[PDB]
Every structure is written in C-alpha cells, then in structure tokens.
Amino acid sequence: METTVLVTFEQRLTTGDVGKLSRLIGAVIPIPYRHHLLGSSQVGLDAVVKDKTRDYSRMRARMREMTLTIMRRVEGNQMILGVPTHGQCYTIRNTGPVSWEKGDVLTTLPPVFSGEVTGLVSVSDWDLVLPWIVPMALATEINQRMMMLALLSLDRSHEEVRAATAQLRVVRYRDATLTLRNVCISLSMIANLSSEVTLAYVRKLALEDSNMLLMKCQEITPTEELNKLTALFVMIRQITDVISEQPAFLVCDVSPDDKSALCIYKG
Amino acid sequence: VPRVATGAGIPTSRQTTVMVSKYSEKSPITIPFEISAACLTHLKETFE
Amino acid sequence: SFGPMKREVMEFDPEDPYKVSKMRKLERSIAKGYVYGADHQAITARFFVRESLGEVEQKNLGVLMFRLDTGIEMPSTVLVSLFFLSMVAENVSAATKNTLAAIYGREGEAIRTWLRDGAWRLHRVVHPLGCTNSITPGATCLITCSMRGHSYNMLKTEIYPLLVPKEIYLDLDGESTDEIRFVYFVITYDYNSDRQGRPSAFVVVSRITHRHTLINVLRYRFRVSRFHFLNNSISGYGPSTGCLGTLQRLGWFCSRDSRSGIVASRAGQLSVVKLEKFYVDVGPLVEFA
Numbered sequence: 081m082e083t084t085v086l087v088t089f090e091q092r093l094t095t096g097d098v099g100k101l102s103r104l105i106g107a108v109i110p111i112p113y114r115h116h117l118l119g120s121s122q123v124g125l126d127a128v129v130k131d132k133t134r135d136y137s138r139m140r141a142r143m144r145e146m147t148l149t150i151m152r153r154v155e156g157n158q159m160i161l162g163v164p165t166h167g168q169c170y171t172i173r174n175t176g177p178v179s180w181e182k183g184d185v186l187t188t189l190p191p192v193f194s195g196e197v198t199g200l201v202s203v204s205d206w207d208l209v210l211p212w213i214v215p216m217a218l219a220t221e222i223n224q225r226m227m228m229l230a231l232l233s234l235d236r237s238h239e240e241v242r243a244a245t246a247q248l249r250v251v252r253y254r255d256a257t258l259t260l261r262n263v264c265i266s267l268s269m270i271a272n273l274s275s276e277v278t279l280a281y282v283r284k285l286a287l288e289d290s291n292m293l294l295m296k297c298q299e300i301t302p303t304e305e306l307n308k309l310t311a312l313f314v315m316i317r318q319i320t321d322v323i324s325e326q327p328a329f330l331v332c333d334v335s336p337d338d339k340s341a342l343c344i345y346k347g
Numbered sequence: 348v349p350r351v352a353t354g355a356g357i358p359t360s361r362q363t364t365v366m367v368s369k370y371s372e373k374s375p376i377t378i379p380f381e382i383s384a385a386c387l388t389h390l391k392e393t394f395e
Numbered sequence: 396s397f398g399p400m401k402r403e404v405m406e407f408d409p410e411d412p413y414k415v416s417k418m419r420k421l422e423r424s425i426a427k428g429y430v431y432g433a434d435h436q437a438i439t440a441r442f443f444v445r446e447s448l449g450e451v452e453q454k455n456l457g458v459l460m461f462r463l464d465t466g467i468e469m470p471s472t473v474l475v476s477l478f479f480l481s482m483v484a485e486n487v488s489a490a491t492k493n494t495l496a497a498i499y500g501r502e503g504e505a506i507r508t509w510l511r512d513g514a515w516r517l518h519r520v521v522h523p524l525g526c527t528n529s530i531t532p533g534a535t536c537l538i539t540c541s542m543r544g545h546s547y548n549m550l551k552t553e554i555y556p557l558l559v560p561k562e563i564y565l566d567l568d569g570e571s572t573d574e575i576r577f578v579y580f581v582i583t584y585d586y587n588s589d590r591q592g593r594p595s596a597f598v599v600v601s602r603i604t605h606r607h608t609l610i611n612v613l614r615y616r617f618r619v620s621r622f623h624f625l626n627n628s629i630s631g632y633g634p635s636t637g638c639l640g641t642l643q644r645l646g647w648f649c650s651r652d653s654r655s656g657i658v659a660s661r662a663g664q665l666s667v668v669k670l671e672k673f674y675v676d677v678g679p680l681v682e683f684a
Contacts, residue, residue, distance in 0.1 A: 081413060081415045081416060167438070167543045168438070169438055169440075169542070181462065181471070181472045182442060182462060182472060182524070183460075183461070183462030183472075183522040183523075183524040184462065184522060185522065185679075185680075216680075217464075217519045254464075254468070254471055255468075291614055291615075291618040291621060291622075292618055292622055293618060293621055293622050293625055295622075296622065296625045296626060296629065297625060299625075299629050300625065300628055300629055327679050330542070330677060332440035332524075332525075332540070332542055333440050333441070333442065342440065344438060344542045344543060346677070346679070347679065354533055354534060355531050355532060355533025355534065355537070356531055356532075356533030356534040356535030356536060356537050357533065357534050357535070358535075
C-alpha cells in the first residue's frame, strides 16, 4: 500500500532474534536516508551512538537529519519498513520509558544511557537501539536539564552547586522516573552579549513606541559592533537548531498494556 | 472460545483464543523373581 | 520473455494513486456486506469518556475535545471541551462562565474548576485532541473523535461544524472576506499578580497562513498583556513566568459558512459561532512573547 524500505540482514538474525523483531512490529525505525534497500548497519541508531567525543545535542543534530520510519513486518532475511505518510494513523510501539496518554504529542529523542542503558537483538556490534518516542513537553524538559547540568558542569568544585546538580538530573513524569557543550557556549554567548549590545539600541528605539512596550523595555567601532551582532544572531540560530524538537506524532488512543498506541503522524 | 457483546459503552472484549498443552507423567514398573543356579543347571546338565 | 512481462503487470495499474486501497476495500465489502468507515479519507478515534464528562458534546455534535495534564496522578487525563475551558479564560463573561459552570458542574466536575483555575494553565496541560462525531450514550459515553479531516455523520450525511463559543471568538475574529479560513488557537496570559494571570483563551480565524505575520496581528491585540509581560520581568527577579502567547493551528473551514448560532443545553443556552465545513487539522505549538 504505502512506501516500502527493505532491510537486508547483513548479520544472521536467529529465529529467536526474529522472535524479538516480530514483537516490535509497530515500532519506529530511525533510517539514515530514504532509499529502498538499506543495510541493517544503516537501519537503527547505533551508527549515531558511537564516538569518544560525541555530545547529546550533536547526536540530536544527527537524528534530526535521520528519517523516521515505521516497522511493517519482519520476513526472515528481510525487515520491511514504511516511511510514514504525513497525516495518517500509525500503530507505533511505546519503547520509551514513558507511558503515553490519549492526545499527547510525541517527539523522537536519542536514548540516554543515564541509568537506563539499553541494547537490542545485537550481533557483531550492531543492535537496533531505538529512539525514545517521548512526549513533547518532556522532550523540551529533557533538553533543558541537559543544558543546565552542563552549564553547572564547570562548577563541580562547589558542593552546593553540585547539590544543585544533584536535584537536577531527576526527571519525573507520568508513571516514570529517569536520570539524565557548544550549545551551552551558545547559551552563554547570547546571555552575555545581549546584555551589552542592547543598551545602545534600547535608548534609541524607546522614543517611538507603537505597541507601548519599549517604555519598560528600558526598565529591563562599527566593525566590532556588527561583529558582536553577527556572532549574536548566528549563535541564536545555533541554539534554535537544537531547541525546536520537530514534533513527530500525536497519539490518539493507547493500546492496553501500554505497548502500543495508534498515533496520527504529524511532521 | 465463544463471543458475545452488548449495549452501548459496555466494555466488549476482543476475540480470545487459547491454546494449551498437557505434559506426561511417567511411572515405570519393574519386578524381579529368583531362579536357582541349581535349578537352571538341570536344563543344561541333563544327566543319564 | 519473463522479466519485462511481469513488470507490465506492476506498471499497468493506472488511473488511481495506488489502486491498492480502493480495490482491496471492495473485496472486503463484497465479503462482509457494505462496510462503513471505509469510504472515509478523514481520520477518527473512539474515546472512553465518563458520564460526568459526557455532556454538551453528547447533545450538540461537532465540538473540540482537549486532554488534561492534571497534576494528580490517578485521574491525570480529563477530557475538556472548548466549551469547558470557557470557565477558565478571562475573555468569557462571568454569566457565560457560570452558564457552563452549571452545565458541567453537577457533582462530577467542580474538581476541574478547582484543578484548572487552581492548578493553573501552563498551556501544556491542554492538548488539541480533535472534534467529535457520533456520540455513544450508554453505560459509558464513547466519543468518536476526528483527528485530520472533517467532522461528519457516517454515511457522509451531514458535515458537523465546529462549535466555537462567542466570547472566545470575537475578541480575535479575523478580517472579512470569502476565501479559505484557517482556525488557529491562541492562549494569552495577562501576567499581573497570580503567577499565570487569568489565562485567556482564543479561537482566532485568519486568512494569514504564515507564522510571524500572524503573531504580528496578535502584537496589535495583546499589548495590554505584553506590557504586563514586560512588567513581571522586572516585578520579579529570580522568579520568571514563561510565555506571553501560545499559537497553534487547529483546522480550517470555508469562510462563507461562518455564521452565528446557539446551543440549547441545560442551565440555559449558550451563544456560539458555527463553522460548518471544518476540516480538523492540528498544528504544532508556537510559543511566543
């Protein structure tokens, strides 16, 4: 019926491992790029989870490039996938740590190994590590905790600041508790430079005030002047690239045992 | 299993189908009995 | 020979986008009698709704449903109508607020006054779920809620409209024309004293499709809230608030069909705006300030 992506099992999938793939019939699949044949080494997110110096946001910058795809059926030597048509309903499988509820917007995130390190049907270093289809309001929440832990990561030498971090990685949502760098440089370039460059621009604009809002906005070298504002706006572009989490689903109703949920596919 | 459902809003089930299997339990019997070596000798020795 | 003769068969299935959906539905409608729910490009879902939530939506048909993230773990997901959160917003007249506070409030609701007005709107408790068709009154109300597409009777007999109440609509009714008309949904806060304000809700229609040109026509309307948004930025140092406004796509309709109406309910009637050919189409949240 729909779009088709076949996955050629370069590794030998034992019938018991097929028994685990035949349980994940609904589950999402991160595909690197839309093509009809892909290897099992392509299919999945393990090629993203792999570097000595690889940061959470950089993986999220990679996964945002990866096309979401949905498992259709596992026929032995092959995995059949469907790139989901936008706007249609899809039975995706709740392989995240969070129970879904009727009406919620679901966002793909890379799985975090903080207290919930997980693998799959692995043989020869390839498992099928599966992205946390997490609710959208918690997806922004998880992002904010990761940056604030990293903004406080330099001041480990204070125990009180370390006790501020000790509360911080405790993430608690409906029926679920889980534990959790240039992006924080990007946070700090906006925090410091907007403090200094706006003062010559508030006092000039505050005379004429159409929406009547510049009045309490005041209450709140031209080459180097633009050089600040260039490296102001481009760092604002860099953080907004890794903030707007591009929502992926809308669960209409949840199948019982919370394994699956019919989800109309959005974005 | 048979099916039945009813009414409006009354929670209807989905079609149950059960497959079960009953395993074997084994007790083997064995019984000895004595024959003398003198007894079996008369079958063999077979006098005048 | 062999190869190309097989590929003619997979080629010459023309004149349809697949002819896989249409043909294979017929071979199961010949099998099972004429099947409903199959000639339906729009998209629905059946939801378990209690009797204390069953009202309005039951009687007059075609209206929004909203999920709650109520901060209590056991009933954490309460269905909310667009009629229902009129007892939260500042826009709604207190008679119009207490008209529908007396419809819902009969001994199965008024927690949800106290855990929406009290447990404030963070504009993340509400989720645009969709619009209704074909309520099932019985032991449990069982609402078929449409997701993408129009709300309509089965048998394609009548387009169910969107029942927008009047107070939430005319404070952001758009301009007058005869085109297609997108329905957006806007929550605006007036940050004055009580950590969220009295979180004001809006059903806004506009010919405008684009994002920041749409929030600019909100930058006309909401200076009273926007100047208060700047106020708590300096009225509280350390404490901060959040968003000023919150925009999301909710659907569209045909804009010659925009006409007023009324629902005929318990605790008096309620003046509404009836948007006839309402294609439900939920969009993403646009948090702005």
